[PDB]
Design a protein around this nucleic acid. Structure first.
Length: 74
DNA sequence: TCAATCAATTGTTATCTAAGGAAATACTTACATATGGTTCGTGCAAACAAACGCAACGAGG
């Protein structure tokens, strides 16, 4: 669960970074500072919970690989 | 016939220099209320951070 927690934290932080701390705050309903500080404080803890809760999702690179394979075959 | 001087009792102070050895543990007021401090998540502005566009400069041709 340790490495799953690390993976989930990395995926979450990547999603926030891609969407944008400012944009993520605007969509969530908080201030950019709140997202910036959740990234430091709770995202690791929530990530460990997800690792235990077994909510891990497919890594996006392998997702792109699967999409490409499904396009090439079909 | 009082007091200056001996005499026994009481209290204070002293007993070498270094190196090793680690310390311990009984002896239980309780329930309620006011207040206030501390922790925590938030917002706002400030303070950094990335990545360009433009212009000036200074070397190359």
């Amino acid at each position: 669960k340790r490495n799953e927690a690390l993976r989930i934290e990395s995926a979450l932080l990547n999603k926030i970074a891609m969407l944008g701390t400012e944009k993520t705050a605007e969509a969530v309903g908080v201030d950019k500072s709140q997202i910036s500080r959740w990234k430091r404080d709770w995202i690791p803890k929530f990530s460990m919970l997800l690792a235990v809760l077994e909510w891990g999702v497919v890594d996006d690179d392998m997702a792109r690989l699967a999409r490409q394979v499904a396009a090439i075959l079909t």
